[PDB]
Amino acid sequence: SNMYGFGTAATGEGSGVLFGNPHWYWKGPDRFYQAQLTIDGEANVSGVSFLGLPVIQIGFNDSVAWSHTVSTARRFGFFQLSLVQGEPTSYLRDGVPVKMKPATITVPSRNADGSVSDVTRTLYHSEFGPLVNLAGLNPALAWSQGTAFAIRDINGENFRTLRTWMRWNQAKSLDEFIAIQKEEASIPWVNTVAVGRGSAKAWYADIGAVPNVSPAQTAACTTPFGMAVGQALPNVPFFDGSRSECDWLTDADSVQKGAVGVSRMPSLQRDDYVGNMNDSYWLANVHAPLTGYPAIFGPAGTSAQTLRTRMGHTMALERLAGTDGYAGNKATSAVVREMVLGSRVFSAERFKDEVLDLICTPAQWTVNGAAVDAAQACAVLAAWDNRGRKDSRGSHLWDEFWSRVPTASLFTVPFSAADPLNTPRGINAAAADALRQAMATAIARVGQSGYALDAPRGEVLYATRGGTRLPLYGGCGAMGYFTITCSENDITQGGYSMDGQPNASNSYMQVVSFPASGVQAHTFLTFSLSDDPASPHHGDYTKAYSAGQWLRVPFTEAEITGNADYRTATVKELE
Amino acid sequence: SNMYGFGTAATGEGSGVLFGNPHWYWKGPDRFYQAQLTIDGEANVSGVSFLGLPVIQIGFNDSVAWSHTVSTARRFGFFQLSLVQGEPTSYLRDGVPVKMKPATITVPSRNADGSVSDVTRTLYHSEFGPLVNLAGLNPALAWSQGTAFAIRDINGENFRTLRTWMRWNQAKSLDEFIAIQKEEASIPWVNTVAVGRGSAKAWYADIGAVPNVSPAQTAACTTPFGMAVGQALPNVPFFDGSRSECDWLTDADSVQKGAVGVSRMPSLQRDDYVGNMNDSYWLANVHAPLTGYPAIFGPAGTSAQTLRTRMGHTMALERLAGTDGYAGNKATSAVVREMVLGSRVFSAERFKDEVLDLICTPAQWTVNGAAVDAAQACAVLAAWDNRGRKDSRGSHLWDEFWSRVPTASLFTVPFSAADPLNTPRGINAAAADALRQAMATAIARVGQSGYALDAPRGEVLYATRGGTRLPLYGGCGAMGYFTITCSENDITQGGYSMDGQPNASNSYMQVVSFPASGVQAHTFLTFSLSDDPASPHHGDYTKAYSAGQWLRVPFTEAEITGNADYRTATVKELE
Amino acid sequence: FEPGRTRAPSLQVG
Amino acid sequence: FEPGRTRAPSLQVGG
Amino acid sequence: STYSAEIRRTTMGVPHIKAGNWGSAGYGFGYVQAQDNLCTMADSFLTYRGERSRHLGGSAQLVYNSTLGRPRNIDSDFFHRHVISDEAVDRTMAAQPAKLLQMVEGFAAGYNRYVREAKAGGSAHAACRSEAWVQPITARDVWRRIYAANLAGGYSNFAEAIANAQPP
Amino acid sequence: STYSAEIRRTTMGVPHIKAGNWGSAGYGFGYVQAQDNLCTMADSFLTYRGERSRHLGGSAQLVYNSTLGRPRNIDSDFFHRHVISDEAVDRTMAAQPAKLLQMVEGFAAGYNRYVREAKAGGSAHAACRSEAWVQPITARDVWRRIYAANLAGGYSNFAEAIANAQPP
Ligand SMILES: O=C(O)Cc1ccccc1
Ligand SMILES: O=C(O)Cc1ccccc1
User: Could you tell me the domains of chain F?
Assistant: First the structure.
């Protein structure tokens, strides 16, 4: 997921601009559903909910617009239980035995022959949360006579989340939005960015529900099992549940027991921009990095950022620098609408020429002892515009190549926290053999798919509606796309079809601003509103997305009633 | 898989006719490859091997033709081990400690990021065979301080299988073929049927390598876990490996230790026919049922046969009664070639009229509280020819329906061993609601697929080659097809495409006879010889199969050199 | 031992 | 404990 | 005392629900979501109630990917019944403001209204409209789904592992 | 001595190998099988040798369905190394007639000849011809594949279970 909040200095208008771009499911019940709710004297809000949720989770009203991205902050931990021996369904706490609480559950299950069998299991809870089978994580982690494991999710006891989005749906300013976020400290697993009418600064926060452990606890309470799997579960507290001093802590300003207090969770307001593309809070704005917050929120300088994070902040900086090829140097709603679909590929922009210089002369190779003719791959890539637009040619060769390049010792300029957008970089001449291996395989895979090496991307990457393959643009985060359209289909099985259950991709998108006349929002719901192939709303929006045609979504009563497709009907029944 | 051997009472000629029809993989290294090997003075054999095998496994020579189908006889068992105190990698044999044999194995493994690292495990053998983790079968079955489990496959010690096929490749008569089968007792997990030049009798056997346990041992040696899991592992001996009295037994005429002796394995010779379609040896010929062989071979008179077995014996009887619509009443090569592709559907032949009479008047239903209009489904199915030929209309609606009908309480006339082709039968009027639910689902699924209820089967079931969808015929065993073309693709994902990794389907087919002038064989290799889409032999045989045009495969030197496509070349090198 | 935790394997070769 | 027996689960929600 | 919602649809079918109170707003919103996505939603309420296996078989995977991933139905059903117990639902609902309790009651009623219409006839949701698992739901079932969304960062990732925790 | 085989191909590409001895028949048969199916075969030799993970990742599944089913590469590798050990290969080979050992040596040599040809050039097997896992094999490797086919009714069905059997 990506989001930006541009402040008034960045937009040059009297209002900021909010860009919401969750990358999310195209099918299933967690997919988004776009709607407006107008509740007399109470709320008037528009945006999306997951199917089955009743309040708007990403959206806007007349006063504030906001979005979310999944946060790096861990939200769960494990507790290693020391068992009362001979009684493996009890565990010790400071030397006193505690019974696990059993639940005998019967599930009816339909058989091949039509009959129904009951399936019965007794499952358990500890004071921390449910027991969990960790033998799959490592066989040494079985529930034995001596040891079991429980998982605690901070959100299992957080009953505040829906109420928080409800209050945001109602909020009449960004100040109020901020106050609600702080009062509730409930946001369960995402960052938030918001822009408000009449506010100069955009808001970023990872203020929500987060386990609270101290560095001294992590050192004292992590069990030897915990240390041995800690690298598989980075920042997840894996603690000795037999010791009460290893319970999650509570701060004087914690809203929930065991959770991080409000003043120790990261946020930032900026006149220019904030953004997030799923790395930690560190670079909400690259000019003003955030540091010093609890380790569980993720690294703030020890780790290189993803290619998508590098691409997303590069796009913001180049817009405000006026060096991205769009007119002017302000992040206006109109320019943001274009920039976020522009499908630049960071890995190609930064590394393609160096890779081609290093491996394309000569263009006939010996790879694993076999003759490989790379002349067409080299020429097609040299000519390619480094974008995944519908008409871009050879972009899918780059996808098959870059995704296969080994990363160890690939770069000669290592990550530097002083420049996390431009490092690491510098393709290592010593990688030449490995890069040719990766390119030979790419060439072979594109060959097997039946597409030409220089096929336009919209023939490779598409969504079928009504029997017609609508051409798409964008790509996968691993290549350094910001515009995400990321198929789970192997290219050799009919190309990058978006028709199955694709990887997290562009879903609900909104660009929202607050001109003097009233909030204005431009939206997409890329997969369309309805899952029913017979509905006119199964493919209409997707046809618009393929065309790059943002929908101006009506908001005021006059806009709704004046809409060219307006229909109304009233549903009523006795409560 | 299916096979028939017709003897001379059925052919009315001086030799029998063999039909081999393994249903098997269309991709992968177990798939068949058709070839002839002529080794001067030693062998001249034609047929198929799995890729990577060097002798013919199913085929013919100038004197005998044979085929195989997977046998119901279990080929393995488990041994539950009683572990030596304090040494969970030792087990007790009649109270004496025996150490398991360790192997510490290191496998190099490529990572996410393209680096390679070592993975090391120490794994174990017992005197029975390798240790096996049975926790996935049921959690109580874990390797604990007191108990472990080993698996014994009698083929683990059977080094005779390849040489038995080699000897069969060289055999000069059906008599010799039989003697080889009995002398080697090595066939590892298949039935065998064969026919010979100049022999009146066709041969059926399940004579090969099979674990040898007595009823007394099954009663006394099966441990409590063995009892508890036995229903998931029918007829698999699950024995106490701490007692030497539970070791598999050796008969006086056992070729291999722990295997069933030659005279206690089923075989049958008939002048009319033998056949098998994957049920046990019982009904190799319906007029002369075989009984009294070891339990491990499977049921002989107490289990209903599958619909495909009922269909395959029905086809043989009706050929010999002259009541199936083909010419005369003999199973000659020419008639057998047409009969085995005829794509009759047993479930529809036997039950479609009873179903439609029960559910189709009225054809406006209430199904789970919902109005359902079944009038077009009823009318399409009534008009349908009960076949899965390329032009058959509605056959896919039948597949989507029958595969969903609850078989518990479906039939009112149970299985009778005295009428095994025609029982169970009698659609139960109490199943009407359940049948309407299945039909409503089937209508919904065909609706989601894009095909009309009355689409010709050739548009739904197809193999694509060179961009063209070649229409196919046949279907899945579950509906009582004999002619198997059984896609793993859901109909709603583009129909019954055969282009992925279909379920076991028609693959190498041979119809082999021995007229005076020499053996004659007509064949298919349905998916074509080569897995490379560039090859002219990736799709040529598939186009012939779609057309039903059997290949007359040349076999004599004059036939090979006289073939319209003949090319030759020599490959030679040192050593 | 609980039958509500048995997972039958595949046993038909092919 | 054998580190190489470890199989990490998928911790990124939506990922 | 009646739910009443005015449903206005514009380009791309986006619904703009207008109502005089929260329960009625829930009523219109549950109705439009079901009208457009009944097959996905009806399948989902089997998930959250732990009733997939009854209808679809225990060894089949979830139909749709989501924050739960696609475990086997039997394990998903154990996970939801154990973690989203009636006790968890009681505690969740006991913490809520009356307006949201009313909204969710209305949402279940709106969804149910649409199920009645789809069972009665129509060319819509032909893929599932006659299935047994297209059925009315309760406000508790919607709280099940709401609580489920909370757990994406933690419990949801260990659904099978929680369903299979057993002492030796 | 020299392997020498005559390859005659007829309609549908069916090859009829003619040779004066068993080693030479194996040479011609290994050659034509590779010539038509190199990609499936080269992938399969990784399976029987326990070398899939090195090239394709331990966590990826087998590419093709077969009697082995599609376990993860790492588990398959361990299964094949443990069960189709060098001893099992030694014992298998010690039990064979000279003519069959000669045939299987010819077969390896004929497969390897085709590997040399694919590495040098040509429009065939574009999908895999330049990959590292296309590589010569030995007679012992062919014996591993031959023994693997014997195991379909027993050990093949429990490959992951055998690979993961470990004391507590
Ligand atoms: O935040 C995301 O990246 C995905 C998501 C965002 C907000 C709410 C649900 C899902
Ligand atoms: O026999 C079968 O049904 C399948 C099969 C594959 C290979 C050899 C013999 C049989």
Answer: 1-168 (1.10.439.10)
